[PDB]
Design a protein around this nucleic acid. Sequence first.
DNA 1: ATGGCAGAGCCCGGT
DNA 2: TACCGGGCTCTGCCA
DNA 3: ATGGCAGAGCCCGGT
DNA 4: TACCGGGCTCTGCCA
Length: 344
Amino acid sequence: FGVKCHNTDSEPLKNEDLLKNLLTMGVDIDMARKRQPGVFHRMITNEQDLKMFLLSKGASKEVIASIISRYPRAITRTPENLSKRWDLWRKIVTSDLEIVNILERSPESFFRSNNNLNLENNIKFLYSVGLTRKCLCRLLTNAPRTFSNSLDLNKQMVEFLQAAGLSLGHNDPADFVRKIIFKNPFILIQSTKRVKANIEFLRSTFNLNSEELLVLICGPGAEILDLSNDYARRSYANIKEKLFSLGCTEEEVQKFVLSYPDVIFLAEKKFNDKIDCLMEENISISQIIENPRVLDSSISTLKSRIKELVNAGCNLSTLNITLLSWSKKRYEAKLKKLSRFAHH
DNA sequence: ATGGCAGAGCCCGGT
DNA sequence: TACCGGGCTCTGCCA
DNA sequence: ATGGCAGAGCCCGGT
DNA sequence: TACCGGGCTCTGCCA
């Protein structure tokens, strides 16, 4: 500055004209403005060029507008910047098409940042962690936000997971980490706060030794680290109480969960109802806890399966109820073999 | 999960 | 020259 | 015989 | 959440 002022007089509004039009010629303008209002109060939008870019990568005009719908801000970013970022993805992705499939799945990922520097940092950091192009690909598809993450953030998660494995005397923490990321691609987009808590859950809940704990966290209990605040704690408490209500043991319950931790992902009501319905048909509580995977089956199949079995002149306290959580093929297979067998 | 949300900072234009 | 602050953007957190 | 073989079930990972 | 099924394992049978 250094000269003078403005206008001071009732002035006509001046908006980005081409915007509204070009958009409607493809996109759901209503939804966008719901999500990213400020984009529309913006002038000089690079919407136009954007389209041609995506088009050059072989993207259906349909899906293109679908992307702007859920993430209006895509318009904001220049084609020259997008080109590099795209190429960075190419490292791990190998294919222009997969990137497309991932964008039409979660647009945020690619567009929530223009920082390609940091994006390069992230990629070369994740390789330095010992990851195969195959694995980073796994990450990129499932948890694309991971690379939109600040390098400091990603570095913090890793350092945390290392310190953790380390603190249990893991002879190779960076590898401990490697395993987790394989069993749980969405690990890098979770707060250390969350994970730390969820780990402390596993710790106190189960009474294992350092080694058993380590193996768990890598193995079956990896997914448990994504769980929401106090969800795991609640979900388990529910299980514990239901089983305890049936005369079980603190240690009986632990094995049951540890032998099949996916039970935590069941809705508290889904679980209770499944157990109750098995109980209804006089199926020993012990039969269940020693065949936890029978709780895979929807109560619907689980129920009919039973009735079918019973009617086929069978004895549910005698038989091997793994049958219930079997393929429609394999189940029907043993069923006839049985109805025929009990048919003598 | 991805979409919503909020705290912090930046762009930018106005005295 | 200095100083203000509106409003978008960015990053990370939640479920 | 013990090694080959087959029917049945389980581990486990992939949608 | 539900559901599938590939392929190893287990048990028992044969000569």
